[PDB]
Amino acid sequence: PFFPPLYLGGPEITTENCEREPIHIPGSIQPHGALLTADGHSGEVLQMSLNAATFLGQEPTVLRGQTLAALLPEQWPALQAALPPGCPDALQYRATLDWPAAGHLSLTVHRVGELLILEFEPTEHALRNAMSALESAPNLRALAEVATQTVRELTGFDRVMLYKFAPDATGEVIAEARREGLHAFLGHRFPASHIPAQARALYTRHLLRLTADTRAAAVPLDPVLNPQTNAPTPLGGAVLRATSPMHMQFLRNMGVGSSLSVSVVVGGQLWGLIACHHQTPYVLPPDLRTTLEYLGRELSEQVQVKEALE
Numbered sequence: 193p194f195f196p197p198l199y200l201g202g203p204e205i206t207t208e209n210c211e212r213e214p215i216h217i218p219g220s221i222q223p224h225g226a227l228l229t230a231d232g233h234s235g236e237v238l239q240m241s242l243n244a245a246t247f248l249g250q251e252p253t254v255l256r257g258q259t260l261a262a263l264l265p266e267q268w269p270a271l272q273a274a275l276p277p278g279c280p281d282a283l284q285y286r287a288t289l290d291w292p293a294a295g296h297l298s299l300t301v302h303r304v305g306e307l308l309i310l311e312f313e314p315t316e317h318a319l320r321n322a323m324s325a326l327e328s329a330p331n332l333r334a335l336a337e338v339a340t341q342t343v344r345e346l347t348g349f350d351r352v353m354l355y356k357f358a359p360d361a362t363g364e365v366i367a368e369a370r371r372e373g374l375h376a377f378l379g380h381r382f383p384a385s386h387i388p389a390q391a392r393a394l395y396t397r398h399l400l401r402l403t404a405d406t407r408a409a410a411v412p413l414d415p416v417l418n419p420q421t422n423a424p425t426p427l428g429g430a431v432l433r434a435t436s437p438m439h440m441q442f443l444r445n446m447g448v449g450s451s452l453s454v455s456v457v458v459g460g461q462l463w464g465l466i467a468c469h470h471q472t473p474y475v476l477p478p479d480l481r482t483t484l485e486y487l488g489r490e491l492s493e494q495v496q497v498k499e500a501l502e
């Protein structure tokens with residue numbers, strides 16, 4: 193059972209309790225975007241990342257308590273209609289905003305219970321071709337190789353691996369596409385503890401996560417608890433959520449500045465990950481993550497199909 197989070201007096205995580213870190217409720221985000229939470233009926237802004245006012249060019253005193261009706265007059269009606277009470281928390285509303293201070297922004301919203309969680313991130317044929325290349329791959333090894341190469345072409349990531357889970361939850365790199373000069377991980381195996389049980393569980397439900405800068409400090413939400421509930425804000429579905437410090441350290445020690453993975457789910461089980469690295473920090477574009485999500489779904493389908501062919 194999970195430890196309390198750090199802001200509720202929980203311990204700093206160590207290697208004796210990796211599996212007890214409540215990674216879904218860090219009460220903080222990555223600094224390359226901003227996060228607001230809002231009441232699902234009134235649109236009152238209930239929580240904001242500490243960088244939100246600066247990120248959005250708003251006056252801090254105005255921002256909290258403000259309504260989405262006032263902050264987002266052009267999206268609020270659409271947002272309400274798209275995300276009514278009781279909808280799947282996987283359901284998304286997305287809009288592109290031309291924000292004077294911030295530039296071109298992507299807004300992604302989902303509902304958890306009575307709370308709307310709004311993520312603002314800068315934004316900046318290929319999909320169909322990629323989907324068809326996966327389809328047309330003749331066997332599982334070729335499928336793995338095509339998936340890693342295609343994802344690398346689309347993203348420009350220094351390394352893209354297909355990381356397959358064994359029944360004991362150890363992991364193996366079974367294909368990779370890599371920048372010239374990077375050492376090979378192909379065929380290397382890693383302990384189950386490096387992607388602990390609660391992470392593997394989360395990754396069965398929320399299929400993409402990333403760390404854009406492995407040296408960046410997390411930006412707290414304020415207030416840290418959802419005022420509706422006096423309880424933690426569920427961020428398992430927020431790509432902006434802070435990454436486990438233990439994992440961030442693991443990445444820095446690998447010389448990885450940016451990391452992103454996409455779940456491969458076969459028969460409702462976590463089969464593996466498309467796992468990506470960059471040496472420098474790197475914010476992968478939002479619509480481009482959408483493409484990666486589609487490719488993850490296609491790969492998951494094709495792994496099942498290819499495993500059936502044998």
Ligand SMILES: *C/C=C1/C(=C/c2[nH]c(/C=C3[NH+]=C(/C=C4\NC(=O)C(C=C)=C4C)C(C)=C\3CCC(=O)O)c(CCC(=O)O)c2C)NC(=O)[C@H]1C
Nearest residue numbers: 207210215382386387391435436438439442451452453467
């Ligand atoms: C004591 C806890 C530990 C720990 C925790 C931890 N690890 C993750 C997430 C990931 N770990 C990954 C592992 C690898 N990436 C690689 O490139 C290789 C090897 C070539 C390995 C073994 C991966 C891929 C992830 C997924 C996230 C990503 O793609 O960057 C988490 C969950 C992080 C989060 O979602 O907040 C946690 C808590 N890792 C350890 O090594 C020990 C110290």
